Amino acid sequence: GPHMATGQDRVVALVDMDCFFVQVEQRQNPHLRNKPCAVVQYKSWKGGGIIAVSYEARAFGVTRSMWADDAKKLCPDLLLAQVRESRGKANLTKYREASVEVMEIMSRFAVIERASIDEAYVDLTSAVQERLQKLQGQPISADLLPSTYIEGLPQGPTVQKEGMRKQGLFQWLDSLQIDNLTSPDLQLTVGAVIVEEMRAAIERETGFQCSAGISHNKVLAKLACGLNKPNRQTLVSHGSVPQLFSQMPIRKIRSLGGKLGASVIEILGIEYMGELTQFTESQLQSHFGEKNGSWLYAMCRGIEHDPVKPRQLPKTIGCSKNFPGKTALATREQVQWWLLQLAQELEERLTKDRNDNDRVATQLVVSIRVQGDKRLSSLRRCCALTRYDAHKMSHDAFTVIKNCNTSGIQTEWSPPLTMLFLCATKFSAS
DNA sequence: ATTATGACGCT
DNA sequence: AGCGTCAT
Ligand SMILES: Nc1ncnc2c1ncn2[C@H]1C[C@H](O)[C@@H](COP(=O)(O)OP(=O)(O)OP(=O)(O)O)O1
Numbered sequence A: 001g002p003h004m005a006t007g008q009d010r011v012v013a014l015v016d017m018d019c020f021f022v023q024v025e026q027r028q029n030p031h032l033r034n035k036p037c038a039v040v041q042y043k044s045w046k047g048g049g050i051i052a053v054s055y056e057a058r059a060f061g062v063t064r065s066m067w068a069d070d071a072k073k074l075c076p077d078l079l080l081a082q083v084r085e086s087r088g089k090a091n092l093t094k095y096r097e098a099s100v101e102v103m104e105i106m107s108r109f110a111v112i113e114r115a116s117i118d119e120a121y122v123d124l125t126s127a128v129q130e131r132l133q134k135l136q137g138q139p140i141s142a143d144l145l146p147s148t149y150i151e152g153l154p155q156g157p158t159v160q161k162e163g164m165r166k167q168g169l170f171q172w173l174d175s176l177q178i179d180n181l182t183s184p185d186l187q188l189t190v191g192a193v194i195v196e197e198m199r200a201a202i203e204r205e206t207g208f209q210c211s212a213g214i215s216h217n218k219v220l221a222k223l224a225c226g227l228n229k230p231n232r233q234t235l236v237s238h239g240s241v242p243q244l245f246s247q248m249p250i251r252k253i254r255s256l257g258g259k260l261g262a263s264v265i266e267i268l269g270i271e272y273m274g275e276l277t278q279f280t281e282s283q284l285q286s287h288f289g290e291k292n293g294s295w296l297y298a299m300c301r302g303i304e305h306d307p308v309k310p311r312q313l314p315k316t317i318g319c320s321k322n323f324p325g326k327t328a329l330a331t332r333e334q335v336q337w338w339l340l341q342l343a344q345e346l347e348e349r350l351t352k353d354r355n356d357n358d359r360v361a362t363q364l365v366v367s368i369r370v371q372g373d374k375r376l377s378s379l380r381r382c383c384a385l386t387r388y389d390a391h392k393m394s395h396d397a398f399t400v401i402k403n404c405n406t407s408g409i410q411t412e413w414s415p416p417l418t419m420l421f422l423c424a425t426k427f428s429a430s
Numbered sequence B: 001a002t003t004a005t006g007a008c009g010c011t
Numbered sequence C: 001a002g003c004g005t006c007a008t
């Protein structure tokens, strides 16, 4: 009844850039604009690996993780932009700096949580309360929501997509009761108005387009954002959840895309998120543990409480490189050379970070992978990070890993290393 | 030879 | 702490 929490206390948005690395390259090179194009790293092995794809190219079936040579088979006129290489490795600085552009604009509207290089969550609860006050009981015009979808609408008693968007929007608005300053649906709508403003600002000031989801929590906001990309935003109301989840594969929900989600499906013998409602909290806790069980019980009802953390900057700064196949490092000075290259990029990014953000990393994590292992990281060791100097860091990294070498000979490295990883962690204010 | 990251959970 | 999971 009225005691039952419905998880409608917050207004949360997720803003995610469209085809982000592609857009970064398209802004820089006008020739790539409005074309099937993709961003690739490296070149020698099968044309390089694709990590971002324009929507024009997606129509041909081009995807992430596809080799460029294979993508060219689906899309002969596919244009390609290469990730910069520095010190023998891919360097993502251009995209990180483009990310900062967007993050700083979003921060003008509310405190954000950086969730990836191209997306951030927004807690709009306070901002919505203040827009509602200066509205002072005026209806929200559809003109204020020019790119907004309302999930689940229209319904009941039409052949074009923009026409459908508007029909759904008018059904939504004409059902809104704005007399109520605590109405969750009204609060979401105002949230959507603000996000329209945010997204306009991002495009105006960077040239980048993005999509967004507006709901009552992070999981629903993330799900919403993807429903109508690119260059659109979607509102998922609490009321839309039963229909939405009744046919929603469990793997589509954030954190359930892996082994846990597979276990939910296998153990319970279900396919869709909505089917979870038929289990007690204790039942779910028994199968998936106390934390996961409570989380699942609430989530399948559209309820989740993970807060938007006040964190705009990444907590770690890392440098990594794979050495696949026959390129695996088999000599000590090979290992030492590449540790230096990684450490030099790390020092560069660390020094920039210290100046920009008034902080200093205090711990260096070293990770390697060995030939034969299917694990991402065969070993992780930490040591102290007392100075921002590449030679010191690479020498220290070598020290903490050098006895991983099985080889009785000290000049040769056995078994060959197929990955190196340097990560600066544990920041302190400075 | 699906690369380069980055956050959070478990024990 | 070191490892595993999930993620973009
Ligand atoms: N697995 C990955 N490996 C390396 N880089 C990645 C990977 N996934 C994503 N990226 C980079 C490239 C992307 O442009 C950027 C944003 O990722 P993501 O939001 O998932 O897709 P996207 O922005 O390229 O397209 P869209 O969000 O419109 O579907 O992060």
Ligand SMILES: [Mn+2]
Binding pocket: A016, A017, A018, A019, A020, A118
């Ligand atoms: Mn994106």
Ligand SMILES: [Mn+2]
Binding pocket: A016, A017, A116, A118, A119, C008
């Ligand atoms: Mn993203």
